[PDB]
């Protein structure tokens, strides 16, 4: 469903990322991993772009999008949002900050939502590809504070790759909250720069040794099935696909 709504707040995070907060319509229900298409008439009256909903649907009045400035439309959105914020804060208030009007269409599903019904999962993501796993990790927390054993997911192995140390800041609060509340060791968090994070989990360096990682995760969960969920570059997808076949892991072709 297509509805007018508003960017009611934004943050400016490292590597040119917008942390948009968007007013959630009453009708709009989503599941973690879902994306939507957004139109910003101030940027283009006719163009729709897709973004992962980086918030969990248990958060009640806003959706969140983490949009990285990589080209024309995302660059213009970044520059509109920067300038509007630079201005209203040079020119105090009198009002609240006005919403940027936008239309949203969705939500749209992804097979990543099947994590909640998996026994053992590997999440692998690179850069802003983290966004659906940000939604999903937050959901996994809310759901364990609600129905403690009602979920069949027993172990989440998380691997987040970045070229730039500063990119870890997008979700370091969330990764910290996971390291606080994870007494029962549901999660194995793994950050690779390709610590200074400030987590108990030490930031590793270089391209991960995926052959050794798969060998280990297979050994831990045999003779059970492991599901690999991947959001990132296609060169990495080809390698993860060969490795999923070698060790009998679930894979969805999402990379062309």
Residues that bind ligand FAD (CB under 6 A): 35, 49-52, 66-68, 70-75, 128, 131
Partner from ligand NAP, ligand FAD, ligand U4F, none binding residue 73, C-beta < 5-8 Å depending on class: ligand FAD
Q: Binding string to ligand U4F for residues 206 to 235, with x set by CB under 6 A, is what? A: -------------------------x----
**What is the C-alpha to C-alpha distance for residues 99 and 172, in angstroms, rounded to an integer?**
27
Nearer to ligand NAP, 143 or 241 (CB): 241
Q: Which residues does 1 contact at the CB level (< 8 Å), separation at least 6?
A: 25, 27, 28, 105
Q: Can you tell me which of 5, 21, 52, 74 binds ligand U4F, judged by CB under 6 A? A: 52
Q: Binding string to ligand NAP for residues 153 to 192, with x set by CB under 6 A, is what? A: --------xxx-----------------------------
Partner from ligand FAD, ligand NAP, ligand U4F, none binding residue 232, C-beta < 5-8 Å depending on class: ligand NAP
Longest dimension (CA), the chain: 64
Q: Can you tell me which of 113, 131, 162, 190 binds ligand U4F, judged by CB under 6 A? A: 131
Q: Can you tell me which of 42, 129, 208, 250 binds ligand U4F, judged by CB under 6 A? A: 129
**What is the C-alpha to C-alpha distance for residues 33 and 109, in angstroms, rounded to an integer?**
7
The distance from CA 174 to its chain's CA centroid, rounded to whole angstroms, is 11
Nearer to ligand FAD, 75 or 233 (CB): 75
Q: Which residues does 116 contact at the CB level (< 8 Å), separation at least 6?
A: 32, 139, 140, 143, 151, 152, 153
Using CB under 6 A as the binding rule, whether residue 110 contacts ligand U4F is answered as yes
Residues that bind ligand U4F (CB under 6 A): 52, 110, 128-129, 131-132, 231, 254
């Amino acid at each position: 469903g297509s509805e007018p709504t508003f960017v009611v707040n934004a943050s400016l995070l490292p590597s040119k990322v917008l942390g948009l907060q968007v007013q959630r319509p009453q009708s709009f229900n989503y599941q973690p991993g879902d994306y939507l298409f957004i139109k910003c008439p101030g940027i283009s009256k006719f163009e729709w772009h897709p973004f992962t909903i980086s918030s969990a649907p248990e958060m009640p009045d806003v959706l969140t999008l983490h949009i990285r400035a990589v080209g024309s439309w995302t660059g213009k959105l970044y520059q509109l949002i920067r300038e509007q914020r630079e201005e209203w804060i040079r020119s105090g208030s009198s009002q609240s900050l006005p919403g940027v009007p936008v239309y949203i269409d969705g939500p749209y599903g992804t097979p990543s939502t099947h994590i909640f019904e998996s026994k053992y999962a590997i999440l692998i993501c690179a850069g802003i590809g983290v966004t659906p796993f940000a939604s999903i990790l937050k959901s996994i927390l809310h759901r364990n504070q609600q129905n403690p054993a009602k979920m069949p997911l027993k172990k989440v192995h998380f691997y987040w790759l970045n070229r730039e140390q500063k990119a870890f800041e997008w979700f370091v609060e969330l990764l910290s909250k996971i390291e606080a509340e994870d007494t029962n060791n549901l999660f194995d968090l793994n950050l690779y720069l390709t610590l200074i994070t400030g987590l108990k989990s030490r930031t590793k360096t270089g391209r991960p040794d995926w052959e050794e990682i798969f060998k280990d995760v297979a050994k831990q969960h045999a003779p059970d099935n492991v599901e690999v969920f991947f959001c990132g570059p296609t060169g990495l997808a080809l390698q993860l696909r060969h490795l999923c076949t070698k060790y009998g892991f679930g894979y969805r072709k999402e990379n062309f």
